[PDB]
Amino acid sequence: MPFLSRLFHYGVDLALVSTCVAGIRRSSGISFEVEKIHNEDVKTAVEKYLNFGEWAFDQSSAFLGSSTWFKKV
Amino acid sequence: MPFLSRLFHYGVDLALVSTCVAGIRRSSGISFEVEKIHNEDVKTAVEKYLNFGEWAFDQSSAFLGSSTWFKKV
Amino acid sequence: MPFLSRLFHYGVDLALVSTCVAGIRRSSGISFEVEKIHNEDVKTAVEKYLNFGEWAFDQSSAFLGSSTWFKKV
Amino acid sequence: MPFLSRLFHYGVDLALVSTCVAGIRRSSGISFEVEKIHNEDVKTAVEKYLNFGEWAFDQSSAFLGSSTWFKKV
Amino acid sequence: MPFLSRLFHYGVDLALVSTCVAGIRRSSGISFEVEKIHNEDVKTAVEKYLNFGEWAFDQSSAFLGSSTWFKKV
Amino acid sequence: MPFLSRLFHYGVDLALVSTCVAGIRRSSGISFEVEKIHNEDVKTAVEKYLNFGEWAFDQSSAFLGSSTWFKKV
Amino acid sequence: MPFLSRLFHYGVDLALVSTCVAGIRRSSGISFEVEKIHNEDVKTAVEKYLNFGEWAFDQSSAFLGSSTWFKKV
Amino acid sequence: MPFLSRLFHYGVDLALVSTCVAGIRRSSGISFEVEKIHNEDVKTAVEKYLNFGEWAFDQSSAFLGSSTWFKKV
Numbered sequence: 001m002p003f004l005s006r007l008f009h010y011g012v013d014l015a016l017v018s019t020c021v022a023g024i025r026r027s028s029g030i031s032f033e034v035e036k037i038h039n040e041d042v043k044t045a046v047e048k049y050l051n052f053g054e055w056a057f058d059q060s061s062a063f064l065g066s067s068t069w070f071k072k073v
Numbered sequence: 074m075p076f077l078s079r080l081f082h083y084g085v086d087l088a089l090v091s092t093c094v095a096g097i098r099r100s101s102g103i104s105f106e107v108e109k110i111h112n113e114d115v116k117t118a119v120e121k122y123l124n125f126g127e128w129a130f131d132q133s134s135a136f137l138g139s140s141t142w143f144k145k146v
Numbered sequence: 147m148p149f150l151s152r153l154f155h156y157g158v159d160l161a162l163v164s165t166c167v168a169g170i171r172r173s174s175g176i177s178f179e180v181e182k183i184h185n186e187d188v189k190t191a192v193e194k195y196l197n198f199g200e201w202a203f204d205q206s207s208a209f210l211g212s213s214t215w216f217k218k219v
Numbered sequence: 220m221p222f223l224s225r226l227f228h229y230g231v232d233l234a235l236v237s238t239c240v241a242g243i244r245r246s247s248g249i250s251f252e253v254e255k256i257h258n259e260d261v262k263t264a265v266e267k268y269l270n271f272g273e274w275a276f277d278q279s280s281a282f283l284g285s286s287t288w289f290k291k292v
Numbered sequence: 293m294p295f296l297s298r299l300f301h302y303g304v305d306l307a308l309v310s311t312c313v314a315g316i317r318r319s320s321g322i323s324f325e326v327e328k329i330h331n332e333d334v335k336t337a338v339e340k341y342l343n344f345g346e347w348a349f350d351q352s353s354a355f356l357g358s359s360t361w362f363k364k365v
Numbered sequence: 366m367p368f369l370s371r372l373f374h375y376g377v378d379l380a381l382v383s384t385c386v387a388g389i390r391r392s393s394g395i396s397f398e399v400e401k402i403h404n405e406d407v408k409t410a411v412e413k414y415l416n417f418g419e420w421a422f423d424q425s426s427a428f429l430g431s432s433t434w435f436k437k438v
Numbered sequence: 439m440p441f442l443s444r445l446f447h448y449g450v451d452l453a454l455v456s457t458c459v460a461g462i463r464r465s466s467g468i469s470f471e472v473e474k475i476h477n478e479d480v481k482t483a484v485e486k487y488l489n490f491g492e493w494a495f496d497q498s499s500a501f502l503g504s505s506t507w508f509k510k511v
Numbered sequence: 512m513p514f515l516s517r518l519f520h521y522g523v524d525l526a527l528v529s530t531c532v533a534g535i536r537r538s539s540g541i542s543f544e545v546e547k548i549h550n551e552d553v554k555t556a557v558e559k560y561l562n563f564g565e566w567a568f569d570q571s572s573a574f575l576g577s578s579t580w581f582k583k584v
């Protein structure tokens with residue numbers, strides 16, 4: 001559970017990019033092909049970046065859902 | 074204002090925020106309650122901003138789906 | 147009521163600066179001395195920038211207050 | 220981590236967000252409910268981020284109050 | 293007075309770049325050779341950008357000097 | 366943590382601010398009141414941040430001077 | 439709205455992206471599929487954005503070449 | 512593989528600058544004279560930054576080429 005330190009590590013714009021990429025996978029099934037990265041340590045780093053977006057997507061949906069300005073349809 | 078001009082007007086930060094909000098709606102059903110905005114001119118402006126993110130989400134999805142670095146499930 | 151167009155005009159960081167300046171005035175009484183600006187059109191432009199921060203402060207407090215993650219003490 | 224190091228770690232964007240949240244608390248009473256965070260490690264990280272904004276709000280207030288371009292009421 | 297509108301058009305980072313270029317000219321004499329640009333459209337745009345930085349340098353100096361956190365040495 | 370990483374640690378925004386502050390000092394004499402900082406660790410960190418700007422100002426001056434688009438006046 | 443304002447209209451992030459895309463085209467031949475855009479107004483706007491990057495690439499090339507810190511190899 | 516960590520350390524704008532510098536070298540031959548830096552600390556930092564841009568140029572080319580939105584001409 002380092003996800004918050006990684007928000008500051010990646011920065012706002014790259015954190016938002018990863019969160020968008022996760023949102024794309026969730027509704028369309030379009031997913032980065034992590035198994036086509038040759039080097040293992042790079043695959044681990046890429047997966048860390050993408051997995052942060054997945055976590056951030058879940059945290060962001062929960063936060064917006066906590067506001068009376070949003071509703072679940 | 075066309076969608077591309079809106080991207081440049083909002084800037085990358087706020088464009089990504091709106092795109093992420095759209096992704097949350099598509100997967101979560103959690104939707105901004107546009108109707109609860111009382112002023113009709115503010116309602117219109119907020120709708121333009123959110124609708125930009127819906128467009129950008131779909132354009133981004135199509136672009137990633139256009140690349141062999143993404144798989145499709 | 148152009149305040150939203152001005153968010154995009156000023157940009158994220160300068161919009162946040164103005165909102166912070168308004169928050170400072172609200173709790174400390176420390177306020178920019180607008181009447182010491184010689185030229186009238188500049189005073190009008192500076193007041194527009196500061197007044198946007200005052201509006202944005204009010205909109206932001208209302209939004210956070212709409213979330214169950216915040217409470218009024 | 221000292222407050223200045225936190226500024227550089229968070230970056231200007233997120234530092235201003237936290238400073239604005241602190242300003243909202245001081246004037247509105249609207250306060251982030253830190254206690255509702257269940258994980259103790261996440262609670263600590265969020266508290267560090269919000270407490271940075273409280274510090275930055277007071278440092279900013281003092282700096283503006285140090286200038287003849289600001290009046291005091 | 294187009295300088296304040298130029299700040300918002302340029303944004304913070306490009307505004308600071310121009311102000312640093314002005315500072316470099318003031319202390320070293322190293323100056324951009326605008327007279328070598330013969331496309332007058334390009335020349336006028338470059339002149340407006342550089343002249344903004346010269347104005348911003350003078351306003352920034354005055355503001356910092358207005359603060360007890362700075363001293364004229 | 367060395368000096369040579371500080372551009373990326375401070376980030377572009379705050380590195381430009383420090384460089385701007387240095388340029389202001391060089392031709393106006395307006396200088397940050399380091400003597401008013403009474404925690405020696407904070408003073409050291411502030412001195413590092415300001416001196417990075419002084420160094421960056423000197424390097425940027427030399428780089429612009431190395432270009433035939435600039436002339437010493 | 440002229441060409442010479444587009445740096446500030448697109449902003450630094452997206453101007454750098456366009457410039458990067460142009461550099462990729464110049465040495466790899468990999469080129470954006472303008473022919474796949476079938477709204478003529480959108481095609482024109484995309485062509486303007488891409489050609490700004492081509493122009494900026496040529497200007498930046500010439501500027502770096504004007505410096506004694508760069509050599510033609 | 513330090514290049515991905517370098518992206519996050521440098522941030523998007525400085526990462527794109529380095530990638531454009533690499534693109535300029537590839538198409539024009541205009542190359543930074545790293546051999547003129549004799550402070551080996553500074554030299555190594557500059558080399559790491561420029562070498563990142565060279566790697567990023569190759570990865571960015573490959574990614575764009577992987578898309579049906581680009582064609583090799």
Ligand SMILES: CCCCCCCCCCCCCCCCCC(=O)OC[C@H](COP(=O)(O)OCCN)OC(=O)CCCCCCCCCCCCCCCCC
Pocket residue numbers: 060069087090093094105109110111112115119122150153158161162165202203205206209
């Ligand atoms: C706009 C993008 C968000 C920008 C924030 C990011 C940085 C902030 C920059 C400084 C502060 C920004 C101030 C701008 C706030 C916009 C206010 C607004 O446009 O909405 C006003 C609307 C009025 O409602 P009305 O019925 O007329 O009430 C009258 C009495 N006020 O009342 C409301 O609508 C209240 C709720 C605001 C809804 C506007 C857009 C909301 C959709 C995006 C929410 C995303 C939250 C961020 C989380 C990111 C997670 C990915």
Ligand SMILES: CCCCCCCCCCCCCCCCCC(=O)OC[C@H](COP(=O)(O)OCCN)OC(=O)CCCCCCCCCCCCCCCCC
Pocket residue numbers: 076077080085088089092129130132133452455456458459470474475476477480484487570571574
């Ligand atoms: C892992 C490797 C990663 C390396 C990548 C980085 C390499 C550096 C260069 C990458 C640049 C990406 C390619 C940019 C080419 C510009 C293409 C373009 O302008 O878009 C054309 C497209 C028109 O498509 P059309 O369907 O006809 O229009 C629909 C209705 N308007 O219009 C569109 O579809 C616009 C879609 C924009 C949605 C984005 C909103 C969020 C902002 C993201 C910021 C970064 C994205 C850059 C967008 C370029 C702007 C044009």
Ligand SMILES: CCCCCCCCCCCCCCCCCC(=O)OC[C@H](COP(=O)(O)OCCN)OC(=O)CCCCCCCCCCCCCCCCC
Pocket residue numbers: 004007012015016019056057059060063206215233236239240251255256257258261265268
């Ligand atoms: C951190 C700064 C905000 C960054 C957003 C700006 C750009 C977003 C970048 C991409 C998306 C960012 C994703 C990061 C979200 C952080 C999530 C987090 O740290 O909080 C997790 C916390 C866990 O709670 P727990 O009891 O453990 O629940 C277990 C099941 N999840 O659950 C929660 O705490 C839920 C509420 C989140 C509280 C974290 C900080 C909130 C205080 C700032 C709110 C400001 C909202 C922005 C409005 C600006 C107006 C000025």
Ligand SMILES: CCCCCCCCCCCCCCCCCC(=O)OC[C@H](COP(=O)(O)OCCN)OC(=O)CCCCCCCCCCCCCCCCC
Pocket residue numbers: 222223226231234235238275276278279351352355379382383385386397401402403404407411414
């Ligand atoms: C209208 C005209 C406007 C023109 C202005 C623009 C001109 C360009 C240059 C302006 C730069 C402003 C002055 C920068 C000088 C650096 C001084 C510094 O580093 O701060 C010293 C201060 C130490 O004070 P002390 O009380 O001893 O510490 C308390 C416990 N730590 O530590 C502090 O107090 C730090 C306070 C930081 C709080 C800011 C958080 C939000 C981020 C804002 C981004 C811009 C602010 C730049 C901050 C400089 C970073 C050091």
Ligand SMILES: CCCCCCCCCCCCCCCCCC(=O)OC[C@H](COP(=O)(O)OCCN)OC(=O)CCCCCCCCCCCCCCCCC
Pocket residue numbers: 309313324328329330331334337338341434445453454457494497498499501502528531532
């Ligand atoms: C210039 C880029 C330097 C950095 C390159 C690094 C690679 C990545 C950078 C890409 C980012 C996009 C940059 C936009 C380029 C602007 C083009 C320009 O203004 O060129 C004007 C001038 C034209 O000279 P010309 O008359 O055509 O040549 C005579 C030959 N017969 O030719 C010139 O050289 C005049 C330039 C004046 C600017 C001086 C400021 C020095 C540092 C500026 C950095 C930011 C640029 C902001 C310029 C805004 C100008 C409106």
Ligand SMILES: CCCCCCCCCCCCCCCCCC(=O)OC[C@H](COP(=O)(O)OCCN)OC(=O)CCCCCCCCCCCCCCCCC
Pocket residue numbers: 309312313372380381384421424425426428429507528532543547548549550553556557560
């Ligand atoms: C350099 C700034 C140019 C723009 C100036 C515009 C004014 C505002 C800019 C201020 C922003 C802060 C910039 C940080 C400055 C970095 C200093 C540096 O790296 O200089 C290294 C090199 C030293 O050369 P040296 O051996 O000391 O001279 C021999 C004399 N006996 O001397 C050098 O010149 C090497 C520089 C290599 C970078 C080439 C890239 C060209 C465009 C870079 C723009 C962004 C800079 C990123 C550099 C990161 C390097 C780690």
